[PDB]
Design a protein around this ligand. Structure first.
Ligand code: G5E
Length: 208
């Protein structure tokens, strides 16, 4: 298990997300689905010139998995996935300059819902999650588990769990007062409102 410090700007962004009073929390789902959609476009694009890039799985989809017992909402995609370097590098983002453009916009009059326009939408997961686990598999690397409960640090370890083939799994360990995001009708309403034009099938799993 390797422990890393977030760059100062990212720690500030996460602290801003966690501590600012902002009721429109549901936007986290749109932001994670949009990242999944970009990762899927990336593997589809590479597959246009190299069909063997899809040897790790031909299905290009997004699964939403609520688990009331574990109090987790999992977003799974079969996108390009991430290497260890991408994971350490703010999960494939330009998060340092992205955070500065975002925080400058917030001072000007913008709101937290515009986070995705600054390429740091992943961090909106902390509007609803106390802990985020990212399981990822890229064709050019091994399977890794990224994890952070914020607090200025994140961990990275080789994942010896269930192999995924290729893609990313975002496990949101929801805050006690954010369990509405495990309800079928609430997830369905959010998907329909903010993600109606995503070019991949979005499957909302049901529970026992
Ligand atoms: O919630 C996420 C977060 C990241 C990924 C991901 N996997 N591979 C690549 S590239 N991305 C990616 C997407 C958008 C911006 C930056 C990125 F690094 C994902 O599939 C889901």
């Amino acid at each position: 298990v390797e422990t890393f410090a977030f760059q100062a700007e990212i720690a500030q962004l996460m602290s801003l997300i966690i501590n600012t009073f902002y009721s429109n929390k549901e936007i986290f789902l749109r932001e994670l689905i949009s990242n999944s959609s970009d990762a899927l476009d990336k593997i589809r694009y590479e597959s246009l010139t190299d069909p063997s890039k899809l040897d790790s799985g031909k299905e290009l989809h997004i699964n939403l998995i609520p688990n009331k017992q574990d109090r987790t909402l999992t977003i799974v995609d079969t996108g390009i996935g991430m290497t260890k370097a991408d994971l350490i590098n703010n999960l494939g983002t330009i998060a340092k300059s992205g955070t500065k453009a975002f925080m400058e916009a917030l001072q000007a009059g913008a709101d937290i819902s515009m986070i995705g326009q600054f390429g740091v939408g992943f961090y909106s997961a902390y509007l609803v999650a106390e802990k985020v686990t990212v399981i990822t598999k890229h064709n050019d690397d091994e399977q890794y588990a990224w994890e952070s409960s914020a607090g200025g640090s994140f961990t990275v370890r080789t994942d010896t769990g269930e192999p995924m083939g290729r893609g990313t799994k975002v496990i949101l360990h929801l805050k006690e007062d954010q369990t509405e995001y495990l309800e079928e009708r609430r997830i369905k309403e959010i998907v329909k409102k903010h993600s109606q034009f995503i070019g991949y099938p979005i499957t909302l799993f049901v529970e026992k």
